[PDB]
């Protein structure tokens, strides 16, 4: 019916984007992945060996195995009525470091150095974040001039 | 015709087994019958030991 073949709906996503073809740059290979690193999957098109599947392109998993040319990644995959932790072996060119935790690893750094910064000074800094509050009762100035009158323009073709 | 996890069974009832059924309703009445056949024999060989 609808051709259950690997690399099927990937006319555009296993394609190098535009005017970035050629042999791949070398800092991609000089990336260091350890166990528990949070990596995100993006299959390229130049390297043919370790592309995961189109099910995982765009998703983000965790490293449990490090090999000579690849990395074992456990990702969550949505099958019909449940998710499953699938462990997929992906070569090193199709992954990169996900920055998705690195705004949390900055504010565990600047939180604990600021926690003891008030412990030595005796204050109540309240380092837990709040979402965007309603605006402060401010006081606008209209110094000298007048608010400009605008009116809806007529219709023309 | 089967279902979830169970035994895979071969019941030997594919034959006319209801004409060959044996009901042990006489098995009390055959135990007191073969007791009496031991007693009426034990006094027939009266001095000789029973069970021969």
């Amino acid at each position: 019916t609808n051709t259950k073949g690997k690399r099927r709906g990937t006319r555009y996503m296993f394609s190098r984007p535009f005017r970035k073809h050629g042999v791949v740059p070398l800092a991609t290979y000089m990336r260091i992945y350890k166990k528990g690193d949070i990596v995100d999957i993006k299959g390229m098109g130049t390297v043919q060996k370790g592309m995961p599947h189109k099910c995982y392109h765009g998703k983000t998993g965790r490293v449990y195995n490090v090999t000579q040319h690849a990395v074992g990644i456990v990702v969550n995959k949505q099958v019909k009525g449940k998710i499953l932790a699938k462990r997929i072996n992906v070569r090193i060119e199709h992954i990169k470091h996900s920055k998705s935790r690195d705004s949390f690893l900055k504010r565990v750094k600047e939180n604990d150095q600021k926690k003891k910064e008030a412990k030595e000074k005796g204050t109540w800094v309240q380092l837990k974040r709040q979402p965007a509050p309603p605006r402060e009762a401010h006081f606008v100035r209209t110094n000298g001039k007048e608010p400009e009158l605008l009116e809806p323009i007529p219709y023309e073709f | 015709a089967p279902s979830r996890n169970g035994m895979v069974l071969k019941p030997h009832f594919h034959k006319d087994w209801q004409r060959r059924v044996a009901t042990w309703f006489n098995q009390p009445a055959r135990k007191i019958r073969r007791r009496k056949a031991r007693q009426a024999k034990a006094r027939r060989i009266a001095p000789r030991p029973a069970s021969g």
Partner: protein, 187 residues
């Protein structure tokens, strides 16, 4: 109308035993009085185990009880089990521990008493320790049943270890295809 629930909302525990044993009903009337009146959680755990099934109240061998009471600190407390105490043949000597159970077996209660021990019921447990103070309550291995090793994923599933229902263990009984790499596949 109010919400869109699936109506769980009927808790499916036990509020009384299905057993009609009148001695066991007197223990419940002893301990559901204690559970609502003594502010101890010992008498809530003992009371909910008197409700439990014969399956959920497994037996406890006499060698686990002396293995789980030779721990540091347990030397002069009481062994409590809502369930039976069978003995181990495997054990050689028995200490002088103090126990408490529904129904210790005949050989096990001969061996505790020779060694200087003391069997209690839940009646004279309640008069000694009403709060449950100075007790080590134990349980038998409730997944020790043979029933639980047929439970799992499915025998044909890969990495299953699930013991199929065969009418006779042996050669020619569920060993050919789906069990070895030659005859078809191995699961």
């Amino acid at each position: 109308g109010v919400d869109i629930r699936h109506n769980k909302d009927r808790k499916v525990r036990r509020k009384e035993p299905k057993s009609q044993d009148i001695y066991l009903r007197l223990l419940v009337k002893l301990y559901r009085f204690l559970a609502r009146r003594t502010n101890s959680t010992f008498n809530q755990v003992v009371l909910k185990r008197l409700f439990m099934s014969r399956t959920n109240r497994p037996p406890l061998s006499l060698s686990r009880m002396i293995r789980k009471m030779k721990l540091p600190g347990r030397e002069n407390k009481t062994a409590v089990v809502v369930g039976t105490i069978t003995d181990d043949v495997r054990v050689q000597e028995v200490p002088k521990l103090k126990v408490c159970a529904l129904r210790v077996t005949s050989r096990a209660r001969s061996r505790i008493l020779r060694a200087g021990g003391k069997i209690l019921t839940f009646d004279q447990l309640a008069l000694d320790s009403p709060k449950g103070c100075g007790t080590v309550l134990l349980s038998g291995p409730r997944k020790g049943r043979e029933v639980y090793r047929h439970f799992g994923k499915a025998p044909g599933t890969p990495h299953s270890h699930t013991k199929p229902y065969v009418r006779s263990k042996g050669r020619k009984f569920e060993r050919a295809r789906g069990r070895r790499a030659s005859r078809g596949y191995k699961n």
